[PDB]
């Protein structure tokens, strides 16, 4: 009934939240790398092109 359901749901929810935090951290790293690369691309257009 309720007692077993709450326990199993709680552990699953906590694991999903930690996994989501790891996914968010990867997205933040990807966005930071993209910002640096975008500045390099702008510099190439400004001088080489």
């Amino acid at each position: 009934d309720v007692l077993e359901q709450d326990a199993q749901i709680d552990r699953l929810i906590n694991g999903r939240l930690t996994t989501l935090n790891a996914f968010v951290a990867q997205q933040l790293v990807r966005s930071e790398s993209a910002a640096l690369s975008a500045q390099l691309a702008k510099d190439k257009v400004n001088e080489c092109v």
Binding site: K42, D43, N46, E47
Partner: protein, 50 residues
């Protein structure tokens, strides 16, 4: 250090002079950029000979 002879990534448009001021946790950068703001069209001759 140098107004010209480098691509103007630091200063938008043609760059004449730049002034730097202290900022909290960093340095603020101020630059001077010329903007044409007008367009007049005239025929161009590529050199002359004689």
């Amino acid at each position: 250090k140098a107004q010209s002879k480098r691509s103007g990534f630091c200063g938008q448009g043609t760059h004449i002079v730049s002034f730097v001021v202290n900022a909290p946790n960093g340095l603020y950068f101020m630059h001077v950029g010329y903007y044409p703001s007008n367009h007049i069209e005239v025929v161009s001759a590529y050199g002359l000979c004689d």
